[PDB]
Write a protein that binds this ligand. Structure first.
Ligand SMILES: C[C@@H]1CC[C@@]2(OC1)O[C@H]1C[C@H]3[C@@H]4CC=C5C[C@@H](OCC[C@H](CO)CO[C@@H]6O[C@H](CO)[C@@H](O[C@H]7O[C@H](CO)[C@@H](O)[C@H](O)[C@H]7O)[C@H](O)[C@H]6O)CC[C@]5(C)[C@H]4CC[C@]3(C)[C@H]1[C@@H]2C
Ligand SMILES: C[C@@H]1CC[C@@]2(OC1)O[C@H]1C[C@H]3[C@@H]4CC=C5C[C@@H](OCC[C@H](CO)CO[C@@H]6O[C@H](CO)[C@@H](O[C@H]7O[C@H](CO)[C@@H](O)[C@H](O)[C@H]7O)[C@H](O)[C@H]6O)CC[C@]5(C)[C@H]4CC[C@]3(C)[C@H]1[C@@H]2C
Ligand SMILES: C[C@@H]1CC[C@@]2(OC1)O[C@H]1C[C@H]3[C@@H]4CC=C5C[C@@H](O)CC[C@]5(C)[C@H]4CC[C@]3(C)[C@H]1[C@@H]2C
Ligand SMILES: C[C@@H]1CC[C@@]2(OC1)O[C@H]1C[C@H]3[C@@H]4CC=C5C[C@@H](O)CC[C@]5(C)[C@H]4CC[C@]3(C)[C@H]1[C@@H]2C
Ligand SMILES: *[C@@H]1O[C@H](CO)[C@@H](O)[C@H](O)[C@H]1NC(C)=O
Ligand SMILES: *[C@@H]1O[C@H](CO)[C@@H](O)[C@H](O)[C@H]1NC(C)=O
Ligand SMILES: [Ca+2]
Ligand SMILES: [Ca+2]
Lengths: 622, 309
């Protein structure tokens, strides 16, 4: 059977129409068909398949079947193994999909696509057993093992395989598909990390010492010395010195360094303006340092705009905005920008001056916390960010129990101690703020224990309590009960509930620390990619880079590169050979396994018993 | 006798050696400053720090005991954990402290008090020092306070804390207490627990290496303890001018006998390894499958020959 001749588009559509009607793919195709019928022979059509694929990849299946809209039904599929793999993946058939992947040309990209589709469908997950089998798909492992084989083979063709635009997946890069699939374990591969290190250092050699690089950063003229080794490849002298300067000052590591230093400078200036040089409204004018801070934040806004609208390429504006706002650091920045603008606006008026100063203090808090993202560069600091996020989630869930318990205890103690205090603010103080402070050692027994209550001048008159002339007299009717409740609260809260939260923290830390390497390598990938696409200048100076880019656009890649047809075909054949070698080694390993040997021995012993019995009977005939 | 530079490099490679060097330098600087009236207090301060260094130097003798040795390594790794935790702690404390200083004392110009309220007070919150009389308006005393900047700088009266939005200051303090005191402190403690677990898994090996190092260190030391060690030093110098348990040179016959003995021991060890490998389950399975294959082929041939008859 020749699959190239066997699989026509009509045949493929017939296969898509022959879905068992008990699996998720049939339901999804039914929903697509119902939507199409509402908006406007074969039960299902390639339009429905394209829409279903769009709900899992949304960029990869660009005109897989919409190109001709519908293609000729007697025409053979241009990518038969790709189509068969996609069809066998959409319906949770993993063995068949494994076979189709083993016969397919672009296997790393196919495996990453399969892992993405498996996780998205396990998010859909109509059933639960299918969802569990689809959680353990092991396609990212196929991609990782094939790429390990490829990287061990050549280590230079592996990088090109990482960055080349695929032919079977609509010019999508393997790294693009891994990002779409969120394949954290693939990004943690040694080959991917090596390519990331090569991108990180740029023109310099990756073995460059940190001390030499920092010292050359702080002494720019020393870059023309041989202190920093660079990778191979009047007017000439100027050109070569400019080339050396640009190659050093364009590397993502130096851009990162400069951005970190200028962010420290920005925080220092922000703190100076907020704490020492915050002047009255424009009647007495903002200080010059404040205007410098305004310009700095304006350049930050320009950088945000560049990242949200003019990032790297041309897509839908809405798609680019969605990609921008999907990053949590991006929305953190947006919050900081909005807070600064509101603060500045309120500060410009006398009646809102204090509110503006308050909002600006909160904005400094937000910017300082924003500074945290640079810790992903270090293995010992990166994973702790993820730990802190999960631990914040743990705190959020613990807060339900804490709030219920504190409401009960605080209202009971407020009723027992100050039944005649009408003021609501003091009600909430004594009911929640004081019990919360008990957790951290703040136990004011002079307000709770009668024997410790001072002889202060106190009133029982409600009007005098409301007026605030004298503090209310605490009720000591049954003070033993108040003290017993405080003892119980101290035990329960401070030991039991606090250590329940701490045990939750410990479990979270243990779970993240088990996978610390993978998490940090994914973080490092994201940080290196972020600073590789950034302009070489740090804000405020980034205004120069923005102006230069705009002027270049008006007047007139390391990753995701397009290859010549011959080199592309050579790479595809090389990867196919690597996949064949990997599968052959897997088969050989399987054959020599203990279970396989046991099965072979038992079967052959059975055959030997039968044939030896026959031979013995024949001999006994003689 | 080696290269002088090699011996110095070997000396300074030991952390206890550089600890001692720090202690000696501190004592010398302290004594020198103490010799002058204008540097007397600085000398006393440096000598106090030197006592601290010497007392911590005393820790090295704990390697002699199995229950004390490994704890030194645990403490070193835990200090590294603290160093890495300090980045998060410093960033968070800078954010919170500057925000609260701006909210509470926007008119206080003095930088020392800025840094006090921005980092020293929030750090002390971690250890139960929560002065609500400076943060909560309802707990603020009726003390005699000024809003004049000149009077604040002069120090005549304490500055009046700003109570513009005190609910926000209190909410920030509540959030800081939760985040820092529970979350971040227990993140550091979980790091500590992981470090302790990793070292305690290999406690025996670490302590035995420590014991080796300590025994070797005190085997090569002169028999007299300082100050008295001056007598041993003078005796050694006099012996050098006028005129080993480990690392000993053997006669040629005994050396050859030892080499042959070790070769025989290695041969016995390798033979036992080979015998263990042969009788393993996997090897037996491989042998049985291969011989069953051979038996199938040869029995088929024999059966065909019999069927010829
Ligand atoms: C292992 C486990 C640990 C936890 C726990 O169980 C065991 O421990 C138990 C111990 C127990 C507690 C044991 C004892 C008591 C005392 C008892 O009061 C007796 C009531 C009498 C009558 O009403 C009040 O007396 C008098 O009051 C006056 C004030 O009103 C004081 O005058 C002061 O007045 C003014 C003070 O402002 C000022 O003029 C002066 O300062 C002074 O003149 C007198 O001096 C004092 O004599 C109340 C109960 C209490 C606190 C127990 C509570 C429960 C425990 C904590 C257990 C735990 C589960
Ligand atoms: C489970 C979880 C725990 C954590 C938390 O969430 C839930 O708990 C919540 C509880 C909440 C708090 C609940 C209540 C409040 C009170 C509120 O003030 C109301 C504002 C008004 C108006 O501006 C001020 O009032 C008045 O001020 C005056 C001072 O200025 C006082 O006069 C004093 O003046 C001088 C004091 O020097 C002296 O003359 C005397 O001593 C006295 O005359 C009055 O007596 C008082 O009436 C501010 C907010 C706060 C603290 C909440 C903050 C957030 C919580 C902790 C929640 C947690 C997330
Ligand atoms: C963590 C939750 C948030 C929401 C909430 O409980 C904790 O906060 C508390 C703060 C309370 C305020 C505190 C002070 C005052 C001033 C007083 O003159 C009138 C009542 C009012 C507004 C109170 C109304 C009820 C409020 C919002 C409580 C509310 C359930
Ligand atoms: C753990 C870090 C060490 C470094 C540092 O932050 C914590 O220490 C802080 C102590 C600060 C001092 C404290 C007191 C004074 C006296 C005052 O009249 C002038 C300013 C000055 C020197 C301050 C300058 C800034 C300093 C070094 C801060 C500096 C970022
Ligand atoms: C309490 O107020 C009354 C009002 O007359 C006064 O006489 C008395 O001295 C006050 N006591 C205290 C402790 O302030
Ligand atoms: C505060 O200082 C003024 C100066 O006249 C004085 O009259 C007043 O008694 C002082 N109050 C306190 C509480 O020291
Ligand atoms: Ca951003
Ligand atoms: Ca020494």
């Amino acid at each position: 059977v020749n699959i190239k001749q066997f699989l026509t588009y009509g045949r493929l559509q017939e296969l898509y129409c022959s879905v068992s009607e008990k699996n998720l793919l049939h339901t999804l195709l039914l929903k697509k068909n119902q939507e199409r019928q509402a908006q406007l022979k074969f039960r299902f059509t390639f339009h429905e398949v394209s829409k279903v694929l769009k709900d899992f990849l949304d960029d990869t299946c660009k005109g897989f079947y919409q190109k001709l809209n519908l293609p000729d039904m007697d025409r053979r599929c241009e990518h038969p193994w790709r189509d068969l793999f996609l069809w066998a993946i959409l319906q949770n058939r993993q063995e068949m999909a494994n076979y189709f992947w083993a016969m397919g040309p672009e296997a790393v990209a196919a495996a990453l696509v399969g892992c993405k589709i498996m996780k998205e469908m396990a998010h859909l997950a109509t059933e639960a057993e299918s969802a569990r089998s689809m959680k353990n798909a092991k396609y990212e492992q196929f991609a990782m093992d094939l790429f390990s084989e490829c990287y061990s083979n050549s280590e230079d063709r592996a990088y090109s395989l990482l960055v080349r635009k695929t032919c079977c997946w609509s010019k999508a890069t393997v790294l693009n598909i891994a990002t779409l699939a969120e394949a954290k374990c693939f990004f943690a591969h040694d080959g991917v990390q090596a390519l990331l290190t090569k991108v990180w250092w740029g023109a310099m050699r990756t073995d460059t010492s940190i001390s030499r690089l920092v010292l050359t950063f702080f002494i720019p003229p020393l870059v023309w010395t041989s202190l920093i080794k660079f990778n191979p490849e009047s007017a000439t002298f100027i050109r070569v010195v400019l080339r050396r300067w640009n190659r050093f000052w364009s590397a993502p590591v130096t851009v990162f360094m400069g951005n970190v230093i200028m962010y420290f400078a920005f925080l220092i200036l922000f703190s100076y303006v907020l704490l020492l040089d915050f002047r009255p409204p424009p009647p007495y004018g903002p200080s010059a340092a404040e205007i410098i801070l305004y310009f700095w934040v304006f350049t930050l806004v320009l950088e945000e705009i560049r990242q949200s609208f003019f990032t790297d390429e041309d897509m839908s504006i809405l798609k680019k905005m969605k990609l921008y706002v999907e990053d949590n650091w991006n929305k953190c920045d947006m919050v900081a920008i909005s807070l600064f603008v509101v603060g500045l606006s309120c500060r410009m008026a006398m009646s809102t001056y204090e509110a503006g100063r308050t909002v600006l203090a909160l904005d400094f808090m937000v910017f300082t916390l924003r500074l945290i993202h640079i810790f992903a560069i270090h293995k010992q600091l990166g994973p702790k960010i993820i730990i802190v996020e999960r631990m914040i989630k743990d705190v959020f869930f613990f807060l339900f129990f804490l709030s219920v318990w504190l409401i009960a205890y605080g209202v009971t103690t407020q009723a027992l101690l100050h039944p005649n205090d009408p003021r609501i603010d003091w009600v909430f103080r004594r009911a929640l703020y004081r019990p919360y402070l008990h957790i951290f050692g703040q136990i004011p027994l002079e307000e709770i224990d009668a024997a410790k209550m001072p002889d202060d001048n106190c009133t029982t008159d409600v009007q005098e309590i409301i007026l605030g002339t004298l503090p209310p007299c605490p009720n000591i009717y049954a003070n033993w009960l108040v003290i017993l409740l405080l003892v119980i609260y101290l035990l329960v809260t401070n030991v039991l509930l606090l250590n329940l939260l701490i045990a939750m923290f410990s479990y979270t830390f243990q779970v993240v620390q088990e996978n610390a390497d993978i998490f940090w390598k994914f973080q490092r990938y994201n940080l290196i990619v972020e600073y590789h696409s950034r302009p070489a200048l740090a804000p405020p100076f980034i205004i120069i880079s923005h102006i230069t880019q705009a002027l270049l656009s008006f007047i007139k890649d390391l990753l995701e590169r397009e290859l010549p047809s011959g080199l592309d075909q050579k790479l595809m054949t090389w990867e196919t050979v690597q996949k064949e070698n990997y599968l052959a080694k897997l088969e050989h390993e399987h054959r020599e396994s203990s279970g396989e040997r046991l099965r072979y021995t038992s079967s052959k012993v059975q055959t030997l018993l039968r044939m030896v019995g026959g031979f013995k009977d024949q001999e006994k005939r003689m």
